[PDB]
Amino acid sequence: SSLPSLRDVFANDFRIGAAVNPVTIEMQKQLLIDHVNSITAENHMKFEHLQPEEGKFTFQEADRIVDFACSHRMAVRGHTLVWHNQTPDWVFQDGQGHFVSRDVLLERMKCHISTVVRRYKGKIYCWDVINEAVADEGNELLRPSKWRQIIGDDFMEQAFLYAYEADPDALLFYNDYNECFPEKREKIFALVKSLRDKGIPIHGIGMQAHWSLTRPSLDEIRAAIERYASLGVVLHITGLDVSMFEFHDRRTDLAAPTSEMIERQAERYGQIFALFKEYRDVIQSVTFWGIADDHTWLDNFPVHGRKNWPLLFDEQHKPKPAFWRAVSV
Numbered sequence: 001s002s003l004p005s006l007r008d009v010f011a012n013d014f015r016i017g018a019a020v021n022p023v024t025i026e027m028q029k030q031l032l033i034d035h036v037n038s039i040t041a042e043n044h045m046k047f048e049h050l051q052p053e054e055g056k057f058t059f060q061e062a063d064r065i066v067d068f069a070c071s072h073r074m075a076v077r078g079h080t081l082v083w084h085n086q087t088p089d090w091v092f093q094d095g096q097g098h099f100v101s102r103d104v105l106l107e108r109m110k111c112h113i114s115t116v117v118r119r120y121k122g123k124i125y126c127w128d129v130i131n132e133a134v135a136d137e138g139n140e141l142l143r144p145s146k147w148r149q150i151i152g153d154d155f156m157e158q159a160f161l162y163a164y165e166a167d168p169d170a171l172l173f174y175n176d177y178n179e180c181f182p183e184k185r186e187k188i189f190a191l192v193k194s195l196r197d198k199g200i201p202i203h204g205i206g207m208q209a210h211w212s213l214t215r216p217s218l219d220e221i222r223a224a225i226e227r228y229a230s231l232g233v234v235l236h237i238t239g240l241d242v243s244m245f246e247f248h249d250r251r252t253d254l255a256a257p258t259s260e261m262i263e264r265q266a267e268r269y270g271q272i273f274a275l276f277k278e279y280r281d282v283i284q285s286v287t288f289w290g291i292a293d294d295h296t297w298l299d300n301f302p303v304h305g306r307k308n309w310p311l312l313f314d315e316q317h318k319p320k321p322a323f324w325r326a327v328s329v
């Protein structure tokens with residue numbers, strides 16, 4: 001009540017978002033209403049939750065998310081159309097269980113993108129069209145995937161063009177994680193630059209920002225922002241969280257964060273939002289992958305069955321020390 005509202009604090013800088021589903025919308029309703037002006041579906045706008053079988057569209061959960069957002073004047077980011085994960089097997093198969101033609105996968109991709117994007121036209125202002133296509137390791141530019149396998153390397157071009165035709169007023173994003181590690185950063189840059197150079201309607205890069213207390217460094221975040229902004233795209237931070245564990249830290253028996261963890265996280269969040277505010281001219285939206293520590297996918301990834309404390313509010317929805325540093329930049 002005397003607490004500052006995130007969206008108001010950053011009114012002149014960027015929207016503040018949260019990834020939700022119908023359960024967490026209920027469980028965290030007041031936090032969302034008090035703090036965010038933007039909503040993303042954590043799972044219920046992915047392919048498997050929209051077209052689980054060919055011709056069977058299940059919009060019910062996505063609809064509730066959108067209805068919530070509209071009834072509280074929140075923008076909506078659509079997530080996500082084309083991705084190597086959470087896409088049912090039928091998409092790539094024929095009756096015989098073999099892989100489909102390039103042309104058949106294109107028709108399925110187009111049908112899906114047109115049905116989904118047209119339904120929410122005028123309520124969803126941007127879409128993560130392509131998710132995580134760039135390789136996370138090695139020196140190949142692109143990760144392997146059945147989309148890429150079957151269609152070829154121009155599947156991303158096609159997807160953006162399909163999405164643009166379905167709603168040409170939407171901002172279309174390439175979305176990815178580890179976006180600030182230099183070698184991956186240069187792949188993302190090179191990929192997006194190539195698409196823009198062919199006139200493909202890609203308007204933005206989504207920086208997932210699934211970050212740790214240490215990685216990436218502030219200098220790596222700054223360099224990535226400037227590298228991407230130089231392409232003329234808009235930047236969204238799309239899944240911000242700050243894990244208490246580094247990647248190598250697979251501990252399962254921490255029942256609570258240490259006070260050192262909590263303190264360093266507050267500092268880390270303060271520094272990060274200072275950096276975001278500095279680049280307010282190119283960052284238009286900052287979405288957390290959740291909103292309070294009672295729900296986070298980091299509880300079970302990358303270690304199943306533990307607990308993480310990655311967000312600005314604790315499990316009782318009370319502001320953490322990271323909250324105070326974040327709003328005071």
Ligand SMILES: O[C@@H]1[C@@H](O)[C@H](O[C@@H]2CO[C@@H](O[C@@H]3CO[C@@H](O[C@@H]4CO[C@@H](O[C@@H]5CO[C@@H](O[C@@H]6CO[C@H](F)[C@H](O)[C@H]6O)[C@H](O)[C@H]5O)[C@H](O)[C@H]4O)[C@H](O)[C@H]3O)[C@H](O)[C@H]2O)OC[C@H]1O
Pocket residue numbers: 042043131136137177178208210239247297
């Ligand atoms: O049934 C369960 C589901 O309910 C649940 O579904 C959902 C899964 O998706 C979640 O939303 C996702 C989360 O964010 C994005 O996907 C993530 C992106 O982060 C990746 O993790 C990175 C892996 O790589 C690490 O880097 C190391 C560096 O060291 C080496 F060089 C290695 O080469 C690298 O591996 C990074 O540190 C990690 O962050 C994940 O692989 C990827 O999945 C999506 O945009 C977004 O949709 C939902 O929240 C969650 O509910 O989970 C699945 C199922 O069990």
